[PDB]
């Protein structure tokens, strides 16, 4: 006989709400992966991808890439997720060095011409180019830096051509002992070994939300229903709760609000710039008040 707390009532959502920016443009991935000329790794290109609808299933499922490795994100979730900006770092490297384009890795390339952050979120995409970039008599248009005074911080582009002083002797452009150039090249030939063939590598740097999003996956939006418990998705950030009107004056640069626990407090709708409070739908403990089962089974 007594009162026991046995379970928890939680209202379930009735319908889903999927919200994304109302953009009718496709992201120009073809002009980057299928390009006439790639930049050298010492002077790698960084193209900004923004204000468009992307589709990462085509690039992932296509059986043409030599490598497809993602950090922070998983390749099958990119269709749901959306970003404020995407940057494509495009350059050619030697095959055995593909392993060096990574956070936490070291070497002469990772430190001198293309360094990644150790918290990098995004994907390293690579494929061989033995039938496009390599030539007979070798390809000498690809230069990388062999010597640097210091090691690169993440995403620095050291385009300098200053002559290296391998000793205390000032060089001023002389090519002798203790005076070498930092620029060296590969001779890519169709007859060279696998590890010595050119590879075209594009690193996709993804910036999670912190501002209005412009590059979102291929997912259609739905209508928004207020004052009901719903399973919502606002620019890829999902959760369950009741969406209500609010009096919170967000500044033009603020997109999301947060509570003490870092959960979302309110969101600004990406299509109509209004603030919706998110209050998780009503819940509570369920207790059973009962006489002992030796008397009655009524509760």
């Amino acid at each position: 006989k007594g009162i026991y707390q046995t379970s928890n009532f939680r209202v379930q959502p009735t319908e889903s709400i999927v919200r994304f920016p109302n953009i009718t443009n496709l992201c120009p991935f073809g002009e980057v992966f299928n390009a006439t000329r790639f930049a050298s790794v010492y002077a790698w290109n960084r193209k900004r991808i923004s204000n468009c609808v992307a589709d990462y299933s085509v690039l992932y499922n296509s059986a043409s890439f030599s490598t497809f490795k993602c950090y922070g994100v998983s390749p099958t979730k990119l269709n749901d997720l959306c970003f404020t900006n995407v940057y494509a770092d495009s350059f050619v490297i030697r095959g055995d060095e593909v392993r060096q384009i990574a956070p936490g890795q070291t070497g002469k390339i990772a430190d001198y011409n293309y360094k990644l952050p150790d918290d990098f979120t995004g994907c390293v995409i690579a494929w061989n180019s033995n039938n496009l970039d390599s030539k007979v008599g070798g390809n000498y248009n690809y230069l990388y830096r062999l010597f640097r005074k210091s090691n690169l911080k993440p995403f620095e582009r050291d385009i300098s051509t200053e002559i290296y002083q391998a000793g205390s002797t000032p060089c001023n452009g002389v090519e002798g002992f203790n005076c070498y150039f930092p620029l060296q090249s590969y001779g890519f030939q169709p007859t060279n070994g696998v590890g010595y063939q050119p590879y075209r590598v594009v690193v996709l740097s993804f910036e999670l939300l912190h501002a209005p999003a412009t590059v979102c996956g291929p997912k259609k939006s739905t209508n928004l229903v207020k004052n009901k418990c719903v399973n919502f998705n606002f620019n890829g950030l999902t959760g369950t709760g009741v969406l209500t009107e609010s009096n919170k004056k967000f500044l033009p640069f603020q997109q999301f609000g947060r509570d003490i626990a870092d959960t979302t407090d309110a969101v600004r709708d990406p299509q109509t710039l209004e603030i919706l409070d998110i209050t998780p739908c009503s819940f509570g403990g369920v207790s059973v008040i009962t006489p002992g089962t030796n008397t009655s089974n009524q509760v």
Binding site: L237, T238, D262, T263
Partner: protein
């Protein structure tokens, strides 16, 4: 106790939904386990003090 929900405990993010919405199962289960261990420890500390 509430402030502890903001901690990462070694995970990529303190928000469970943000982990689940970007990574698939295999590694995500590891990231979730990190948060479960930390948050469970937080509750045990709270209960002991109470």
């Amino acid at each position: 106790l509430v402030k502890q929900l903001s901690s990462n405990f070694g995970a990529i993010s303190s928000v469970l939904n943000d982990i689940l919405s970007r990574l698939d199962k295999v590694e995500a289960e590891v990231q979730i386990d990190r948060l479960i261990t930390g948050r469970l420890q937080s509750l045990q500390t709270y209960v002991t003090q109470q």
